[PDB]
Design a binder for this molecule. Sequence first.
Ligand SMILES: CCCCCCO[C@@H]1O[C@H](CO)[C@H](O)C[C@H]1O[C@@H]1O[C@@H](C)[C@@H](O)[C@@H](O)[C@@H]1O
Ligand SMILES: CCCCCCO[C@@H]1O[C@H](CO)[C@H](O)C[C@H]1O[C@@H]1O[C@@H](C)[C@@H](O)[C@@H](O)[C@@H]1O
Ligand SMILES: O=c1ccn([C@@H]2O[C@H](COP(=O)(O)OP(=O)(O)O)[C@@H](O)[C@H]2O)c(=O)[nH]1
Ligand SMILES: O=c1ccn([C@@H]2O[C@H](COP(=O)(O)OP(=O)(O)O)[C@@H](O)[C@H]2O)c(=O)[nH]1
Ligand SMILES: [Mn+2]
Ligand SMILES: [Mn+2]
Lengths: 290, 291
Amino acid sequence: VSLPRMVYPQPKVLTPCRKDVLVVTPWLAPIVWEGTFNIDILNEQFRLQNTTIGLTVFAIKKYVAFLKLFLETAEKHFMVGHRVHYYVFTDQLAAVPRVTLGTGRQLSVLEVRAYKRWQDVSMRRMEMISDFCERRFLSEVDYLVCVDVDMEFRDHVGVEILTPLFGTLHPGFYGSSREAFTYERRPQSQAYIPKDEGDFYYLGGFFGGSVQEVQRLTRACHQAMMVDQANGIEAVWHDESHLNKYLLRHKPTKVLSPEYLWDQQLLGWPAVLRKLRFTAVPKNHQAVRN
Amino acid sequence: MVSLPRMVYPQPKVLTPCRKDVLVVTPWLAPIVWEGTFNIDILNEQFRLQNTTIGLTVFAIKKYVAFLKLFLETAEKHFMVGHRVHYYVFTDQLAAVPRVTLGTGRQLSVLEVRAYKRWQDVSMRRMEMISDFCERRFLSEVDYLVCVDVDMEFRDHVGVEILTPLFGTLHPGFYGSSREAFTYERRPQSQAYIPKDEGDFYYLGGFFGGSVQEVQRLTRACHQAMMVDQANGIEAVWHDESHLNKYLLRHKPTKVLSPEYLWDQQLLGWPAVLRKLRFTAVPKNHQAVRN
Ligand SMILES: CCCCCCO[C@@H]1O[C@H](CO)[C@H](O)C[C@H]1O[C@@H]1O[C@@H](C)[C@@H](O)[C@@H](O)[C@@H]1O
Ligand SMILES: CCCCCCO[C@@H]1O[C@H](CO)[C@H](O)C[C@H]1O[C@@H]1O[C@@H](C)[C@@H](O)[C@@H](O)[C@@H]1O
Ligand SMILES: O=c1ccn([C@@H]2O[C@H](COP(=O)(O)OP(=O)(O)O)[C@@H](O)[C@H]2O)c(=O)[nH]1
Ligand SMILES: O=c1ccn([C@@H]2O[C@H](COP(=O)(O)OP(=O)(O)O)[C@@H](O)[C@H]2O)c(=O)[nH]1
Ligand SMILES: [Mn+2]
Ligand SMILES: [Mn+2]
């Protein structure tokens, strides 16, 4: 389908986008930073295919308190102008706040089991996402975006992230070397990566892609965790550790910069970030995990 | 996909770009393939596990059959070495194709085509010929089609780093220019028309490709645009190249190849920005060879 006439500044070949940071991976996937992309062209590209973006989010037990701010900020910054179908997974149906949604956007609530330990709740996300895409076949959406709930949107998060498979760089470890990365270092684990391996440390709280790729990934990670459980082992960073094992063995077709998941309290706002888009809501871990 | 094996390679650095001297990504987030931007180990893994097959089309019409020898022999050294390759030589002379020894898992087929008298028609009619070829045997034989001029020789690596849904190549004598200077078709009456305030890049008609579905889509559309022009009594300023540039403007390429992938050393030298010269023109006499 052909793009219409558009007027915009010309891509200048001998004038780099950004010079301080890496904008492309050695397997030729983009790293998304401000000033790398023209959202006008990308919006038009994705609007011509009438793209539908699913956004999954688990708000179990005390994490329902996070829903309102998460959902309202999503209205103002997440894939605006495009079709959005939210998926809210919770143990409490009544506790989901009434959030006014812009046109072409809807919400569905799906009840799940509540696990005792906070590690299991986070881990079993992979299982529940997989079981849901299996049950729906795909149908409704073209892409799925899977994020933590304890977050607020502050700036634009649009179709630039959309690609068959994507992860995001953990804000803690983008300037760290691979032996400083907190991979699972026990060879007994299905998530084991030795000190000589690894590209990036990816976040467990922001990944996604096409439905096919996301179903594939969540299933791989859950079965990987089931073998660990049977072997009596729990991965150091739980769901995150298995995603890292997976994105090492199956490279993402785009990678997102720490612009797309930050913590201003813990890490501030360094010069390499022109925009903070998706940010940690301050939480008392021990108390909110009960 | 296909699960990658354990590999040992230098770690990519987020705070340390490979190339600070060039644009390595388009405004629509397509990689621009320069030397330094990729690790061939990783890419060779990804594709080889797919059992990827590459089709290379090339036109040897009339006197341009003389170029085939050097073209094919240099391709065997540098083009897609280690992957399944099939050469498609389109000629009006089946007895003029030189006997070139191929590596394992590599094929060559000669297809007979007519020879239009004018060189412009020879060049422009490649789009129809590639498309009729694509339709004849759908995506029956290859996963990707690469479509290149013959007045050429490989001088360095040209591999699976080029493979994507749809790619184009930055013209060597324009990569530094500004869009108003690009020699697009400027007459509103032509289909290839692009006004002064549009355009991202000036692409080459002598090096493009992509997936079988995408290439056949491109060549067909280009041929149709040309038929409409010939009916209107107009021929685009730079022929198939012009129609291609219109097509890639309206359908952005998923990868862009840097001038590394088509250069003229006799005309333009070897600038510092080009670490390699992978695929270069063979100096020719334009009036005589085109006849
Ligand atoms: C020495 C560097 C410290 C950087 C902070 C690390 O954050 C934590 O990283 C581990 C992986 O090793 C895991 O992903 C949890 C993560 O902490 C969460 O996210 C950060 C950004 C903060 O918001 C924490 O409070 C969260 O619990
Ligand atoms: C101001 C730019 C000068 C660069 C040389 C122009 O080359 C010719 O450009 C036209 C369109 O503008 C078309 O692409 C043909 C092209 O000439 C061929 O390619 C170059 C690189 C040389 O190798 C020539 O000998 C070829 O005929
Ligand atoms: O009791 C819980 C514990 C976890 N989660 C979900 O699991 C994710 C991971 O937990 P958390 O955000 O605390 O991990 P962290 O950001 O600390 O790594 C949360 O975002 C929630 O979506 C939940 O809904 N209820
Ligand atoms: O008489 C001709 C004219 C052209 N060509 C083919 O069309 C391509 C483009 O023509 P040419 O190389 O002259 O264009 P240039 O590179 O000079 O712009 C050539 O590489 C050939 O493959 C051919 O085979 N015979
Ligand atoms: Mn979180
Ligand atoms: Mn040529």
